[PDB]
């Protein structure tokens, strides 16, 4: 019929790419299809695995003859859900269309119906897909068994629509589909390489196809491995084919396709380049150049990360085992975002203080009332699942319930965190870091003695006490941030001034800051316990608050030429106003 | 049935395309692909998705395009004729079929279909089961023809999940707001049509000011579309508004007025004369609210920074949290704030929005239910009133899920409901209040001489409110207890509120200065704040007057005097009638 396209007819005339691999998965389909009862195969796989290719490829074997005798005359038809629902405008009209196609196929023997995205039509309740209650017109044919149907449902939907419904599950044979191995991915592209080469009229290099798959899966982090490779290869050929007006380069290179991935990934070409060793070698020089202070703390972190990326040790274990421990306001948070920005991995911030209540711990694994909402899953699990290359920043870990510490111990040992929904998350490529603002109270604690001059200077001991000895064994090394120097604080003040100057440029108002003014801001905006945290408020109240009063009315409305000074006797800031 | 965009370019029907060089490179790159050779220009309303498709044809004729695209001609589907012209069955099939043969046999020919979402929901006269989408589906899969589409963000997602086969064939292309420099240039190209229709001339400065004034005040529409509305209306205003003089030229003062009308902001706002209102807002709050001068200064200072421009434009006008003891008027200052500025006050009591299911109503209800048509209360309220005050009283009582919504508002500044209707918070001030600070030690210190062992402030607020949410707040304005001196001023206003009530009954109330002091000290409670003063004024003044008003001399109306007796230390009421 017009709704469905005959895959066998299409394969006979060409236009269908060949299927490479998937022998073990494809053979399972032939096994269940030949069954007398419960012969409806179900292709449960994640998006991009190539579920449709397995169905299209199966038809190629029938026309070619590489199937049993029973499957010789078999014909596979792909149902177009869009054609049925389109133009109905009446709940039930869609059902009438399905019956006509079903009756036609039921008459002919040895007929199969490849229902793509079957989950859309059989959704339990209101859905954003088919929006049709096709449960009524799906169980009868499945129960009758006259015509067998192939369903390309996703792993998520299968766990809810098929599992909950006994009729669907009892008349469907699950066929697990997994992503192919990296070595298998290149073989798939090599087989399909001539088709794309003949179209673009360009020849791809063997090194490009191999390197493209490695950087595609890591930098894009959007789709699955099979879809990325086919997309980048097609994208690369198109770009080089029309890059110059007259010139052209039939050959391809790794550096050429790297620029293409930058656009779809929205990352600079330098980071997208396969130069992880180069960035790792100069990791300390980059962080020290981007941020100042805590040089000793930063240098120790680079040596440890190099040990994990070398490949030694157990691969299942997590790559990141670092426990930051120092006063806040010294840039402890900034190194976590700068490290991710340089390496290209994403940044995931999970504040432990919010996850303080015992009940809140459960949210990480799953929402308490989320029975209908199984798509979101656990808060921690979903972030890791979507982003397998991202830094995890845990703040105020010292103030957490005891059960929370055990959750971290499990991943540090096995490297895999299970989910109640059943999703499998891997921390092998996820770096884990946590900060603790402990020991600062002990240092700032006023001594009970008469002289009060007693200093502790042993805050590291308190860190080991707040954490159990078991946790200390798992972590290889802990990072310690030393107290900042008054000279370093002056550079932090300039950072806020630069941002203020840029904001004023849009209005044509200048800002001059004296060297003596910076000293007042540094002392006022720096606290021993909070570090540079008050600097944001101190800069705003001292500089921005009065400015707005004059900017709203006064000489500063136009002309700019702002000037700031401080009286030496009273040590108070006075800002001169010029028109 | 169709129109040749390439031929239209030669005649000049389509104005020269300005900018969008990166977008064109992305469209042509994906277009030449072996698979996914159908670009989709997803964008918002008025961004220029159709103009980009039409602009491409201009580049084809001029030859700027790579030679791969040279010799190609773009066509457009006659959406109007196909939807309604071919009402009868058979005609739609035979006429469309002819276009397929014309599309094929010429690889250089590329079709364009504006509003491609329409063909998905096609219409059938007698349910023939044949539509434009199914007819082109085999062709697109084979790749013999290439097409270009256009749709909305909310509509693009609606059809993406519903149909995966069509989504696979099409490649999404993100569109962004053009730069201000790009916007003024296009208006010059479109100037001959608008200026000639109204018989006026637009100044060069007006074009630049129009785009700047629009984005500053008008945030519902998009910059490219905004400029056309303020320009088309500006010329119309000069044609009908100056009926006596009929000014031919357009001045900068003209367009700014049109922006104010379209933006629904008080006149002279574009002139910036409203600075006086913010300049003297402080004094009005001081007289209305006593004992909170320090708190009013922090709130007033923060508001000035937003309007002054010393802040992030995406960030809202303000985000403050009011915490303190009961009766400090932390919610009274929010109410009076709206009256001073004149903007509408949006009150959202959080006691009602306490459950997870109830919090959903803030951003909208799920689809497929009776409450789908209701929409989002918070989104609808802020969209109707862009310049308004959003009051979230007793936020601590609300479920923690509501904080997730507030975290987004303070970060991005925009909130979109389930339906897809975006809401802007740039001109709305966020003023939330909490009663966590009310807790304090009621018992006094143990000892012969008491001590002021007051509990610390903000300690309990750290555990109740998450750190990330706490930091996002611009400033947490604390409210101090009302001292004995401040209570004297509070009583004075309560008598005024009582005097106006008596004015409707013909009774004039005169209270002595000594009487005011007795009422203040009688009910001055630090923990209860200002509420006891109402009960003191109620029990001592309203109760006797009410008895006389119903059964007494005050039935008609008259003067009354209140004075305390030194010997008895009790108020004495005299009625003159």
């Amino acid at each position: 019929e017009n709704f469905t396209t005959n895959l066998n007819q299409l394969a006979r005339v060409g236009g269908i790419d060949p299927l490479i691999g998937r022998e073990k998965e494809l053979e399972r389909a032939i096994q269940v299809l030949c069954r007398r009862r419960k012969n409806n195969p179900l292709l449960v796989g994640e998006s991009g695995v190539g579920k449709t290719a397995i169905a299209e490829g199966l038809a190629w074997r029938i026309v070619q003859g590489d199937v049993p005798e029973v499957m010789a005359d078999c014909t596979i038809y792909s149902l177009d859900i869009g054609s049925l629902l389109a133009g109905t405008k009446y709940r039930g009209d869609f059902e009438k269309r399905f019956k006509a196609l079903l009756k036609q196929l039921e008459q002919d023997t040895n007929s199969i119906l490849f229902i793509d995205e079957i989950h859309t039509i059989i959704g339990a309740g209101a859905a954003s897909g088919g929006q049709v209650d096709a449960a009524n017109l799906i169980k009868p044919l499945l129960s009758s068994g006259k015509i067998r149907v192939i369903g390309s449902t996703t792993y998520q939907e299968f766990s809810n629509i098929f599992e909950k419904d006994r009729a669907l599950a009892r008349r469907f044979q699950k066929i697990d589909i997994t992503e192919p191995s990296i070595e298998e991915t290149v073989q798939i592209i090599n087989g399909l390489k001539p088709k794309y080469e003949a179209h673009h009229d360009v020849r791809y290099t063997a090194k490009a196809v191999r390197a493209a798959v490695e950087l595609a899966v890591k930098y894009i982090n959007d789709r699955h491995l099979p879809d990325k490779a086919i997309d980048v290869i097609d994208e690369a050929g198109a770009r080089a084919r029309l890059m110059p007006v007259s010139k052209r380069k039939k050959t391809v290179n790794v550096a050429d396709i790297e620029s293409v991935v930058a656009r779809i990934a929205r990352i600079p070409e330098k980071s997208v380049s396969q130069s992880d060793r180069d960035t790792l070698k100069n990791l300390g020089d980059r962080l020290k150049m981007l941020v100042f202070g805590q040089d000793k703390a930063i240098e120790a972190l680079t040596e440890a990360i190099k040990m994990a990326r070398a490949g030694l040790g157990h691969e299942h274990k997590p790559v990141g085992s670092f426990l930051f421990a120092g006063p806040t306001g010294v840039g402890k948070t900034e190194v976590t975002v700068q490290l991710s920005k340089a390496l290209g991995i994403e940044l995931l911030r999970f504040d432990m203080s919010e996850y303080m209540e015992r009940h809140t711990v459960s949210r990480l694994i799953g929402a308490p009332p989320g029975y209908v909402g199984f798509d979101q899953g656990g808060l921690l699990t979903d972030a890791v699942i979507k982003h397998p290359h991202a830094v995890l920043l845990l703040d105020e870990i010292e103030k957490a319930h005891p059960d929370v510490f055990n959750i971290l111990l499990q991943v540090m040992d096995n490297g895999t965190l299970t989910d109640n929904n059943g999703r499998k998350a891997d921390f092998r490529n996820v770096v884990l870091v946590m900060t603790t603002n402990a020991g600062v109270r002990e240092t700032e604690r006023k001594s009970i003695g008469l002289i009060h001059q007693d200093n502790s200077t042993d805050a590291m001991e308190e860190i080991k006490k707040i954490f159990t000895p078991e946790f200390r064994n798992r972590l290889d090394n802990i990072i310690w941030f030393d107290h900042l120097s008054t000279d370093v604080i002056h550079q932090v003040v300039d950072k806020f001034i630069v941002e203020l100057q840029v904001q004023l440029d849009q209005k044509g108002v200048s800002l001059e800051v004296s060297q003596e003014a910076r000293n007042w801001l540094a002392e006022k905006g720096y606290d021993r316990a909070m570090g540079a945290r008050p600097m944001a408020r101190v800069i705003q109240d001292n500089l921005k608050k009065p400015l707005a009063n004059e900017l709203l009315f006064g000489s500063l409305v136009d002309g700019g030429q702002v000037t700031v000074a401080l009286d030496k006797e009273k040590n108070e800031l006075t800002y001169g106003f010029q028109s | 049935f169709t129109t040749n965009l390439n031929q239209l370019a030669r005649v000049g029907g389509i104005d020269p395309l300005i900018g969008r060089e990166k977008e064109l490179e992305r469209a042509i790159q994906v277009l030449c692909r072996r698979r996914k050779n159908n670009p989709l220009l997803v964008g918002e309303s008025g961004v220029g998705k159709t103009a980009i498709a039409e602009g491409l044809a201009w580049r084809i004729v001029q030859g700027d395009v790579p030679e791969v695209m040279a010799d190609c001609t773009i066509y457009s589907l006659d959406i109007g004729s196909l939807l309604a012209g071919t009402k009868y069955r058979g005609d739609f099939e035979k006429r469309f079929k002819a276009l397929l043969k014309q599309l094929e046999q010429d690889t250089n020919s590329i079709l364009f279909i504006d509003e491609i979402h329409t063909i998905i929901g096609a219409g059938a006269a007698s349910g023939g089961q044949v539509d434009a989408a199914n007819l082109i589906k085999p062709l697109l899969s084979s790749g013999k023809i290439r097409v270009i589409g256009s749709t909305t963000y909310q509509e693009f997602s609606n059809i993406f999940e519903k149909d995966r086969a069509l989504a696979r064939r099409f490649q999404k292309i993100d569109i962004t707001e053009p730069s201000i420099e790009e916007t003024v240039q296009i208006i010059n190209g479109l100037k001959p049509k608008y200026e000639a229709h109204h018989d006026v001339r637009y100044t060069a400065k007006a074009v630049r000011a129009a785009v700047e004034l629009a984005v500053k005040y008008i945030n519902d529409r998009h910059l490219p579309d905004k400029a056309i509305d303020v320009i088309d209306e500006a010329g119309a205003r000069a044609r009908l508004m100056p009926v006596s003089k009929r000014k031919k030229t357009v001045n900068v003062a003209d367009i700014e007025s049109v922006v104010a009308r379209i933006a629904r902001i008080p006149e002279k706002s574009v002139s910036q004369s409203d600075r006086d209102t913010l300049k003297n807002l402080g004094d009005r709050l001081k007289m209305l609210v006593f004992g909170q001068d320090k708190a009013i200064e922090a709130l007033t200072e923060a508001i000035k920074m937003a309007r002054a421009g010393l802040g992030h434009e995406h960030k809202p006008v303000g985000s403050f949290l009011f915490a303190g003891p009961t009766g400090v008027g932390k919610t009274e200052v929010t109410v009076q704030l709206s009256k001073a500025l004149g903007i509408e006050l949006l009150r959202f009591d959080m006691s009602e929005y306490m459950e997870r299911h109830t919090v959903s109503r803030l951003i909208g209800a799920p689809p497929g239910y009776v409450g789908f048509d209701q929409g989002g209360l918070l989104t609808d309220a802020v969209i109707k009133h862009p310049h308004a005050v959003l009051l979230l009283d007793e936020i601590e009582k609300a479920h923690p899920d509501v904080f997730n919504i507030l975290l987004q508002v303070m970060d991005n500044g925009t909130l979109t409901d389930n339906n897809g209707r975006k809401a802007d918070f740039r001109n709305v001030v966020l003023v939330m209040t909490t009663n966590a600070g009310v807790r304090e030690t009621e018992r006094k210190s143990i000892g012969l001489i008491h001590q002021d062992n007051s509990t610390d402030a903000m300690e309990e607020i750290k555990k109740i409110f998450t750190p990330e949410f706490r930091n996002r707040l611009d400033n947490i304005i604390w409210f101090d207890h009302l001292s004995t001196d401040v209570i004297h001023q509070v009583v004075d206003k309560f008598i005024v509120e009582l005097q106006v009530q008596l004015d409707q009954k013909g009774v004039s109330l005169e209270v002595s200065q000594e009487a005011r002091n007795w009422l203040a000290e009688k009910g001055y409670d630090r923990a209860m704040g200002a509420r006891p003063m109402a009960r003191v004024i109620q029990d001592n003044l309203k109760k006797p007057l009410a008895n006389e008003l119903l059964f007494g001399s005050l039935v008609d109306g008259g003067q009354v005097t209140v004075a305390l007796d030194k010997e008895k230390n009790e108020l004495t009421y005299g009625f003159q009638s």
């Binding site: 308490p368 209908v372 | 299911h357 239910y369």
Partner: peptide, 25 residues
């Protein structure tokens, strides 16, 4: 004792639509 948990029940909405007829002549 641990706190209790309450589960809500959402009701689906579906309605029937009448049909008017137009005679040709």
């Amino acid at each position: 004792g641990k706190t209790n948990d309450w589960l809500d029940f959402d009701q689906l909405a579906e309605e029937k639509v009448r049909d008017a007829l137009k005679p040709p002549s």
